[PDB]
């Protein structure tokens, strides 16, 4: 019944809508609008860099939804580079920040 206006996965906002029938009449058919955001709480500011401070402020301009990001996506891989000094040889290597989703 409910149509979907927004399915953003970066902000996990699911804007939908539905019109409910009145008490056996075509009048006062009140419309609805459901919004459901799920705040991460444990994610960093720069989601692709595990050194930036924690994410405190959350700004939601609903107009744009219907680029800084908030959450990860169940269908993508995040990677980075770190120095390793094995055998006194500083070396950069690609590290799967979000493993199990890079297979």
């Amino acid at each position: 019944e409910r149509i979907v206006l927004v399915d953003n996965k970066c902000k996990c906002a699911r804007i939908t809508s539905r019109i409910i029938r009145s008490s056996e009449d075509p009048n006062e058919d009140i419309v609805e609008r459901n919004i459901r955001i799920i705040v991460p709480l444990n994610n960093r500011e720069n989601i692709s860099d595990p050194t930036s401070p924690l994410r405190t402020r959350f700004v939601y301009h609903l107009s744009d939804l219907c680029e800084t990001c908030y959450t990860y996506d169940r269908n993508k891989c995040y990677t980075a580079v770190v120095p390793l000094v094995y055998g006194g040889e500083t070396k950069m290597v690609e590290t799967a920040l979000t493993p199990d989703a890079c297979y």
């Binding site: 996965k9 419309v31 799920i38």
Partner: protein, 128 residues
């Protein structure tokens, strides 16, 4: 020479209180030089020309070179229980895609019941 801006409006709230009919208005402004006409299609099927009444291009109140036009259409009141969205369209030479289909439905419009339900967890790091 500017992009012809277009808009659409739904029937008035007090209009849906006599149970005779309803009117939907598609406003076309700009389109310099004045070259537009509107065809009101529904479900991809053009409606009869006797329903929509386009009149003429008219200069804007302050018109350096801009113009505007208005076109309405008449429907039945009892048909709005399903909407059908009654699409509008415009055509002009100063458009990259020369079509700007515009359509609205009972569902689209002003909401009267906001139901925000935000939730806070620590396992929401990934959006499932």
């Amino acid at each position: 020479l500017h992009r012809p801006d277009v808009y659409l409006l739904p029937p008035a709230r007090e209009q849906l209180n006599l149970r005779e009919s309803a009117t939907i208005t598609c406003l076309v402004t700009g389109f310099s030089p004045a070259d537009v006409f509107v065809q009101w299609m529904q479900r991809g099927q053009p409606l009869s020309p006797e329903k929509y009444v386009t009149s003429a291009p008219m200069p804007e109140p302050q018109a350096p070179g801009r113009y505007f036009a208005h076109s309405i259409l008449t429907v039945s009141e009892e048909e709005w229980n399903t909407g059908e969205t009654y699409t509008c369209v415009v055509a002009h030479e100063a458009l990259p895609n020369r079509v700007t289909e515009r359509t609205v439905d009972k569902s689209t419009g002003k909401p009267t019941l906001y139901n925000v339900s935000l939730v806070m967890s620590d396992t929401a790091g990934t959006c499932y």
